[PDB]
Design a protein around this motif. Structure first.
Motif, PDB file in Angstrom:
ATOM      1  N   UNK H   8     -39.105  95.951 -19.329  1.00 32.93           N
ATOM      2  CA  UNK H   8     -37.748  95.433 -19.202  1.00 32.93           C
ATOM      3  C   UNK H   8     -37.043  96.330 -18.186  1.00 32.93           C
ATOM      4  N   UNK H   9     -35.968  95.824 -17.584  1.00 32.67           N
ATOM      5  CA  UNK H   9     -35.310  96.486 -16.468  1.00 32.67           C
ATOM      6  C   UNK H   9     -34.577  97.753 -16.902  1.00 32.67           C
ATOM      7  N   UNK H  10     -33.867  98.354 -15.939  1.00 38.70           N
ATOM      8  CA  UNK H  10     -33.177  99.623 -16.167  1.00 38.70           C
ATOM      9  C   UNK H  10     -31.708  99.407 -16.506  1.00 38.70           C
ATOM     10  N   UNK H  11     -31.036  98.580 -15.707  1.00 35.49           N
ATOM     11  CA  UNK H  11     -29.691  98.122 -16.022  1.00 35.49           C
ATOM     12  C   UNK H  11     -29.642  97.419 -17.373  1.00 35.49           C
ATOM     13  N   UNK H  12     -30.563  96.483 -17.594  1.00 32.59           N
ATOM     14  CA  UNK H  12     -30.471  95.627 -18.765  1.00 32.59           C
ATOM     15  C   UNK H  12     -30.876  96.362 -20.037  1.00 32.59           C
ATOM     16  N   UNK H  13     -31.848  97.275 -19.962  1.00 31.82           N
ATOM     17  CA  UNK H  13     -32.192  98.079 -21.135  1.00 31.82           C
ATOM     18  C   UNK H  13     -31.112  99.100 -21.451  1.00 31.82           C
ATOM     19  N   UNK H 142     -36.243  86.375 -24.531  1.00 29.03           N
ATOM     20  CA  UNK H 142     -36.570  85.049 -24.017  1.00 29.03           C
ATOM     21  C   UNK H 142     -36.543  83.984 -25.106  1.00 29.03           C
ATOM     22  N   UNK H 143     -35.401  83.872 -25.797  1.00 26.65           N
ATOM     23  CA  UNK H 143     -35.084  82.917 -26.881  1.00 26.65           C
ATOM     24  C   UNK H 143     -36.213  82.629 -27.875  1.00 26.65           C
TER      25      UNK H 143
END
Lengths: 65, 313, 63, 141, 101, 67, 206, 143
Positions: H8-13, H142-143
RNA sequence: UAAUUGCGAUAACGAACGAGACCUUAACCUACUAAAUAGUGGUGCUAGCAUUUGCUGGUUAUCCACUUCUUAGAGGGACUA
RNA sequence: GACGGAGCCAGCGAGUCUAACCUUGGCCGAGAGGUCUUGGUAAUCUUGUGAAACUCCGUCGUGCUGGGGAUAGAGCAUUGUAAUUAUUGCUCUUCAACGAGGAAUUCCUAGUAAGCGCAAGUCAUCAGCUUGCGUUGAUUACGUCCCUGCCCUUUGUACACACC
């Protein structure tokens, strides 16, 4: 070039006079032929040997020992 | 014997060439792009051989190479003062041979393939083992040991080997490697001597160089037969295993001669488009097949062209 | 409008006082035999094409 | 014997090592996938060799690249050069010559040299000017 | 039986390479394991100094340099061989040190 | 501008004047030949000597020289 | 569509949009047309690119800046005015947003609007300096095709900056607007206004 | 099929773990969360004067996960900034050692990060575990 | 030609310094020597996860290799082929 | 573009013996710092020198605005026997001239100019300087003798203190 460092050596002396000082800048360029530490020539002289001829015909045949 | 296709995959002059005597359908070609490349033969009239593998790493030109007859070990004499032993599968570095203080020039294996011979530009003739220790260290030549060749002697696998070697200090020396010494010496070349070849039966050596004079020494009674005027530099020499031919790539063409009796069959010239007359692409590497049905010729311009045997009419 | 499209045969030489203008010959891309001396501003080479709104002038050294 | 191979790409100081093993398809830089290294405007520049060659060959190679030096741009150029070199070194050593040369020619017919180290290095700063060739302005009067 | 570490630090590179060649020949003459040469980087001692005296003329700087090379070898020796390889292994200028553990 | 000076031109004329039947038109072979028969102090100087020597042999197989 | 999925995902949007033809970010490289003579071999649109950052050597030989792809040259031209030297990822993000604005404004392919714009705004005859004793008049000269491309891109970017400077208008919006008006010239754009003035001084000084 | 944080990304995590931290609440945050600058390289207290402690704690948990071990000084050197020295030219100055100390001690008071051998602070088994439970959340984003 | 750089022309010939050659550094080299004051791999042992073998690690000496990237010696290479 | 979080990427270098060098790690200080040990006579530790430009999300929307921070007042620490005529760092606040620079004039042709930081020299403290190093990284030429200069030949001279 770097032959300044290798094959010539300088010697700068201030020599004290009756009047003002004089100065001697002796540059002794030794031979490259006896520079026994370092490369035996200035990089400007190429030393070749001369070879020996061989007669053309020679009769191509066989020897045996 | 007219041309039947085109082979490419090297980048420099294709210097040397070999096959295996059990399986004729694999090739190993050594070329001036510091790399040794293998082909499979498929017999297509435009892509006759198809690239399989390449053994790499040499710091200079791989000049010579030879394989064994079951495709097991590959030997590449290269001008980075070594000879490299591999398998033709997975290209893994089996045995490096260093020791020549100048460029190695020619390597070969004998008929049991455990005595490795390397003639070298430190004026020397070296015999190492498959392990990498030196059995024989031979002095005797004044100038370069340019090409060396084992001879196939008589049947039944006698415990005795016999070798020939050119030298551009004007000699053709044959050496006996039981007590590591000279056995015979033949003289009569006028210029520097590049290539020499021994026969299938171990009695004919045909040797020539920059002269264009192919001289044949019979090691039976140690006699010297004749000399045919090749009139340009004979780049590569080969004996045919069935027709007893002298197949020679020379500095303008490819002269192929039938020995019994004295008649020249063919004077090959591959036609080009673009290269000129004093800028001719010349042949360098020659090899017959193990069965003697196809002929490989590698040139200065990276290419290998292949000749077939066929009828007259 | 007569906007004429011509093909450089040969480039001629670096004219101009400052040394940035090129004398050039142009074949007309439509007739082979109309070849014109023309002074061009940028870098020109052989085999390429030019635009001219007055393709008739044929001048000489820019001093 | 776990048929891996280590290759290497090198930009002006960003030097990447490329480990290639016979695996399941994962391509990773600094432990994360290449889709999660984030200059993001060179993301397609590192996406170049994979969707260049058509991705169904990458299914039997796992590649892991680690870079030291440089900046973000030169590190992306280092990893794309290094995994392309590792791909063609795999297809030299472990599969066929003409597959190696086919990927090699398909890389040459686009390349920003892509398997070749670039010789472009920074020139020294010469004295008498804060640029490498620039000088300090003079007065004359 | 002891286990030493000799460090050769010098600037005359071929005198360094020759004394390390002497050391690896004496180590293979009675082999220890092999322990060949470990090669530290060239420490570059650069000074930038103005070429000019008291200040009239264009501004010029010379970067005088010293080029220091450090190398070191482990050895598994007796004490008498330690004394010989610190005493009869000597050269002008080549700093030699033997650190024991 | 790759124009060869008097040391390379004179020494290459000397080695072709006394060593025509040893040399050839091959850059690699003549580089190794200047290794063997040349007492020189530079690999780049020897490379330039061997290159002009192959140049000279390539025109000498097509005609003589005035010198 | 022949899919393949691996250990790492590498999503299907990418695996579909790029494997059959190599696009831009997502833009049509196919069916573009340079409608004009004298401008082929001086634009470069036939060999595409993924994004317009590239590591090319474009100075060591003479004419390889024409071999350089064109929207790269757009990014290179927009990273000037030396408060902004060397922010090329900022510049190429600006052209990514710019071609986005071109597709939301117009139905045309945005690289086609770039080709159309520099083809339409590239001036045809310039006027260079003569020594000119006294009045110092200047001789008309037919400007070269490489300089057509050069002055076209240059005047596009100078209009982008000096119409984008002191206003809430941002760079991709201003560059997009100069690009569409220089494509289908309205004589309201600064690029083609400078083009018409170059043609006027060339005619009146011929 | 396998969950780690590097997928998972850096911003989003960092934002997801900050949302987790301001959800779970009790961290022993300091009292001066609206007074401070976060660094001497800043000329204005931060914009979100509410939850920057939770973003800082999430990012430093990610940083300690990614690394081997780290201390307050090297976290200051990481979170330093470009300093406008006025008319004088810019330099690089360190960040707030007190704020970095109290956020590292707050993650010690959870036990997210702990004291390490050879000094400094290293991640806990439960710190990795709860980081991977929210990685399980974000890898099921992812729902 | 960057070059009084060479080819050539000659009441000049044979030389010297300068330029070039030289030296340092920068680029490539799976090619020899290697290394707990460099890095990798595997077996240590284990941490988090999903547990479908996996991923990302942690371990100053737990071992064995290994020299690709690093380091520096000896060399290669380009000579406008 | 400023600002606030978040991503996170360099290389040449310096570093204490009989006395005050680089300082990792814990503790408090909004900050500057001060403290308790550990590590380095250095490819061993400072160091992955986690540097900045750049990158993403978010406020601000043309007003000499939050851009710029000059000046100036109050205070806290550090260096020094000593700081006032501010040594430096930091906190609050004050919010100037500056609306892209006239006639001139300078540097530059590839990892080059330019933006961007770091090391080092003097150094108790002070870098806007310099010598080096790396990061991002171009537009434009591949010419010219026009201007400013240079070398060679030819020519003129009433010049040689040599066209000042």
């Amino acid at each position: 070039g770097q032959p300044v460092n290798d094959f010539i050596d300088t010697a700068t002396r201030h020599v004290l006079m009756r009047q003002g000082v004089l100065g001697i800048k002796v540059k002794i360029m030794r031979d490259p032929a006896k520079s026994r530490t370092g490369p035996k020539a200035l990089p400007d002289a190429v030393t070749i040997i001369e070879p020996k001829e061989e007669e053309p015909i020679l009769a191509p045949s066989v020897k045996d020992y | 014997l007219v041309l039947r296709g085109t082979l490419e995959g090297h980048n420099g002059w294709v210097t040397s060439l070999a096959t295996s005597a059990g399986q004729p359908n694999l090739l190993l070609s050594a070329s001036r792009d510091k790399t040794l490349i293998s082909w499979k033969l498929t017999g297509d009239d435009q892509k006759f051989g198809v690239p399989v593998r390449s053994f790499k790493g040499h710091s200079h030109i791989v000049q010579d190479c030879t394989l064994t007859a079951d495709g097991a070990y590959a030997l590449s004499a290269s001008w980075d003062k070594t000879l490299r032993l591999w398998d033709v599968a997975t290209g893994e570095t089996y045995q490096r041979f260093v020791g020549h203080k100048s460029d190695v020039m020619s390597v070969d294996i004998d008929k049991k393939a455990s005595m490795i011979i390397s003639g070298s530009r430190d004026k020397t003739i070296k015999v190492w083992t498959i392990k990498g220790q030196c059995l024989a260290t031979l002095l005797g030549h004044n100038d370069w040991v340019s090409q060396v060749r084992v001879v196939p002697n008589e049947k039944a696998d006698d415990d005795s080997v016999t070798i020939i070697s050119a030298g551009n200090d004007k000699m053709v020396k044959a050496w006996n490697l039981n007590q590591f010494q000279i056995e015979a010496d033949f003289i009569g070349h006028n210029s520097n001597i590049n290539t020499l070849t021994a026969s299938p039966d171990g009695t004919l050596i045909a040797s020539a160089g920059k002269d264009g004079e192919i001289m044949l020494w019979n090691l039976a009674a140690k006699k010297a037969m004749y000399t045919l005027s090749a009139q340009d530099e004979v780049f590569s020499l080969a004996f045919s295993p069935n027709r007893y031919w002298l197949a020679a790539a020379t500095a303008t063409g490819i002269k192929v001669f039938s020995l019994d009796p004295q008649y020249l069959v063919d004077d090959l010239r591959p036609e080009f488009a673009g290269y000129s007359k004093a800028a001719e692409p010349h042949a360098v590497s020659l090899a017959w097949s193990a069965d003697g049905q196809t002929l490989f010729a590698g040139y200065t311009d990276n290419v290998i062209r292949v000749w077939q045997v066929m009828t007259a009419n | 409008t007569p906007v004429t499209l011509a093909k450089v045969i040969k480039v001629l030489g670096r004219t101009g006082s400052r040394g940035g203008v090129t004398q050039v010959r142009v074949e007309f891309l439509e007739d082979t035999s109309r070849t014109i001396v023309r002074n061009v501003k940028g870098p020109v080479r052989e085999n390429d094409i030019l635009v001219l709104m007055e393709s008739e002038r044929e001048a000489r050294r820019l001093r | 014997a776990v048929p891996s191979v280590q290759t290497f790409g090198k930009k002006k100081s960003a030097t990447a090592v490329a480990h290639v093993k016979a695996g399941k398809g994962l391509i990773k830089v600094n432990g994360s996938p290449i889709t999660l290294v984030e200059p993001e405007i060179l993301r397609f520049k590192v996406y170049e060799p994979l969707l260049l060659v058509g991705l169904d060959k990458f299914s039997n190679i796992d590649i892991r690249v680690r870079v030291t030096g440089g900046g973000h741009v030169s590190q992306v150029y280092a990893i794309r050069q290094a995994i392309a070199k590792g791909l063609v070194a795999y297809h030299q050593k472990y599969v066929d010559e003409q597959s190696k040369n086919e990927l090699k020619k398909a890389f040459t017919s686009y390349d920003r040299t892509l398997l070749i180290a670039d010789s472009r290095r920074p020139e020294p700063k010469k004295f008498g000017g804060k640029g490498a060739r620039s000088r300090f302005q003079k007065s004359y009067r | 039986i002891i286990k030493i570490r000799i460090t050769l630090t010098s600037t005359k590179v071929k005198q360094l390479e020759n004394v390390s060649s002497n050391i690896v020949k004496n180590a293979e003459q009675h082999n220890l394991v092999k322990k060949g040469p470990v090669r530290l980087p060239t420490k570059v001692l650069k000074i930038s100094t103005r070429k000019t005296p008291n200040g009239e003329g264009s501004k010029t700087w010379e970067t005088y340099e010293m080029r220091i090379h450090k190398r070191y070898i482990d050895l598994e020796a007796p004490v008498q061989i330690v004394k010989r390889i610190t005493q009869i292994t000597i050269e002008p200028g080549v700093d030699v040190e033997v650190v024991v553990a | 501008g790759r124009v060869r000076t008097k040391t390379v031109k004179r020494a290459s004329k000397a080695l072709i004047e006394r060593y025509y039947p040893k040399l050839t038109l091959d850059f690699q072979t003549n580089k190794r030949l200047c290794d063997e028969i040349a007492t020189i102090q530079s690999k780049r100087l020897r490379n330039k000597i061997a290159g002009y020597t192959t140049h000279l042999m390539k025109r000498i197989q097509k005609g003589p020289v005035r010198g | 569509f022949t899919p393949v999925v691996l250990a790492t995902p590498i999503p299907e949007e990418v695996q579909q949009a790029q494997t059959e033809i190599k696009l831009f970010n997502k833009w049509s490289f196919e069916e573009v047309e340079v409608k004009d003579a004298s401008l082929v071999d001086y634009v470069q649109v036939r060999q595409p690119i993924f994004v317009a950052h590239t590591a090319g050597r474009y100075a060591n030989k003479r004419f390889r800046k024409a071999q350089c792809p064109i929207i790269e040259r757009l990014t290179n031209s927009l990273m000037m005015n030396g408060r902004n030297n060397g922010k090329k990822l900022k510049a190429v993000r600006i052209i990514k947003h710019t071609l986005d604005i071109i597709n939301v404004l117009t139905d045309q392919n945005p690289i086609q609007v770039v080709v159309d714009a520099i083809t339409n705004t590239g001036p045809r005859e310039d006027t260079t300096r003569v020594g000119g004793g006294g009045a110092a008049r200047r001789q008309a000269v037919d400007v070269s095709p490489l300089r057509r491309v050069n002055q076209a891109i240059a005047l596009l970017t100078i209009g982008a900056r000096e119409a984008a400077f002191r206003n809430i208008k941002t760079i991709a919006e201003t560059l997009a607007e100069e690009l569409i008006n220089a494509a289908k010239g309205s004589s309201t754009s600064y690029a083609i206004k400078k083009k018409d003035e170059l043609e006027r001084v060339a005619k009146s000084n011929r | 099929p396998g969950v780690s944080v590097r997928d998972v990304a850096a911003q989003d995590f960092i934002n997801a773990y900050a949302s987790f931290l301001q959800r779970q609440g009790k961290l022993e945050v300091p009292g001066y969360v609206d007074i401070v600058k976060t660094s001497s390289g800043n000329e204005m207290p931060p914009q979100d004067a509410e939850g920057w402690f939770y973003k800082r704690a999430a990012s430093v948990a990610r940083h300690i996960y990614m690394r081997k071990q780290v201390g307050v000084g090297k976290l200051n050197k990481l979170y330093g900034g470009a300093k406008s020295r006025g008319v004088r030219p810019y330099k690089h100055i360190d960040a707030s050692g007190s704020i970095n100390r109290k956020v590292l001690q707050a993650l010690e008071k959870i036990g997210i990060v702990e004291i390490s051998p050879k000094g400094g602070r290293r991640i806990s088994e439960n710190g990795q575990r709860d980081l991977d439970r929210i990685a399980a959340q974000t890898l099921e984003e992812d729902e």
